[PDB]
Amino acid sequence: SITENTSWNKEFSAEAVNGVFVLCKSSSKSCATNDLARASKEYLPASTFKIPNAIIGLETGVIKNEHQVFKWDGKPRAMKQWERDLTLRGAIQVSAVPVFQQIAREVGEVRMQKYLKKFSYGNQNISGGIDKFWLEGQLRISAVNQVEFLESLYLNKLSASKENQLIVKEALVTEAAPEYLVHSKTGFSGVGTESNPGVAWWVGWVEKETEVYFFAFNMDIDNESKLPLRKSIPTKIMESEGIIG
Amino acid sequence: SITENTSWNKEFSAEAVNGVFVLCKSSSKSCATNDLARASKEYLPASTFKIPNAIIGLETGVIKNEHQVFKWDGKPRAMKQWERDLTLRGAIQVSAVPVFQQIAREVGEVRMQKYLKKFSYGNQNISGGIDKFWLEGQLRISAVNQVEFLESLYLNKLSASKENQLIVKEALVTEAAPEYLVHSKTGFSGVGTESNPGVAWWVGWVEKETEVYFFAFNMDIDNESKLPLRKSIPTKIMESEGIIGG
Ligand SMILES: *[C@@]1(=O)[C]2[C](C([O])=O)[C](O[C])S[C]2C1(Cl)Cl
């Protein structure tokens, strides 16, 4: 399945970044990575968890349908971008944490556990509170597991209805051209401490002509100013592969 | 109950074009157009027909599923961009006529007629050739009918599985930002002469924040260099309406 490509470290060392990129053409059966060990090391998913959380909210009927609006109650939120009504797509795209915290509460620990089992989602440990397990709790997943998850979603092979998978897929589109389509989701757990840094992610897949490439990136982050690297490092790697695009 | 907004006409005259723009906020119960008469006139749909044709291809099973690949057999095609295997979205986005002529033949006249009736698609006249009725045959549809069809698609209300309607919607995404998403399709019947012009279209819808706007534009085309007006005239109107830009 997985092979090391040590040329890809240039991008990490340039920035003194401890991280991993996993990139798979056509399927998870052929991945390459800069760091064999870290590729299956597991980290808080943070807001990449909105992908399965959204699927689960639709499957359970907690989210009515693709057209549900999540209204802002006018009360303060941690980000200005979350202070307004958001569609499902909008709430994923701006990573509106409190929308999904309330979705998780309505889903409930029994159903959330059930679904993460069906999804083979990381260590499947949702302890730490129903509305914060993926943010500061015990849930962990690796970049390889993300790429496996995203591939099932791409093929509509998760245990949820095909309509709900397609709904979340359109919500993930972040770049659209006549012959190049990108689906992707960022994550950022916070800056932690210098001793125990946070994690940042970018995961998704690229459709180019008739090919597909799945990717998952994570890195340790103790400084918010380093945040863009979660897209720029994978972007430069994929550009050097001719994928981007 | 469509209203006329004549102030939009200066965007057409400025470019010496005759055409119509229909724009509906929230639903087709709230539409506005520059030209009430041309808004209901019916024109050859050209490549805009790839929308219903794709849904029908999926419903009939001619198109196997969303990941179907349409293989190029190597024989020459009008455009290099068509001379390659294509996904369903790639074939729509580059408007690869030959892939859809073949889907249309496989669907055949009986089933095609039946879906166009279910979809209330234009004059529903597909006569004269199953693989060109939308390119140079008798099929005709108005800008108001395009917006009503597209709203149905957006709402998953067409007579087709929700799943196939979702497949086709993703294939129509042309613009994407975190709170702005555009689904659309161009079409162009060919450059005509001044007295017998072709038609160019741009149809689709825009989700901005939590609002949705359905739109359909067409214009007479008798000069090839004017083709890009099919996008810049409606773009300018949507700017002045405050949909494009903050
Ligand atoms: C989720 O992890 C989002 C992060 C992300 O990756 O998008 C940041 O968004 C820029 S902050 C929000 C949280 Cl941290 Cl919950």
Task: Outline the secondary-structure elements.
Two copies of one chain form a homodimer.
Chain A: E1 2-4, H1 9-14, E2 19-25, E3 31-33, H2 36-39, H3 50-59, E4 69-70, E5 86-87, H4 88-93, H5 97-107, H6 109-118, H7 143-155, H8 162-172, E6 173-177, E7 180-188, E8 198-208, E9 211-221, H9 229-240
Parallel strand pairs in A: 1-3
Antiparallel strand pairs in A: 2-3, 2-9, 4-5, 6-7, 7-8, 8-9
Helix pairs in contact in A: 3-5, 3-8
The ligand *[C@@]1(=O)[C]2[C](C([O])=O)[C](O[C])S[C]2C1(Cl)Cl binds next to strand 7 of chain A.
Protein name (chain B): Beta-lactamase OXA-10
Subcellular location (chain B): Periplasm
Binding site for a beta-lactam (chain B): 95, 186, 188, 230
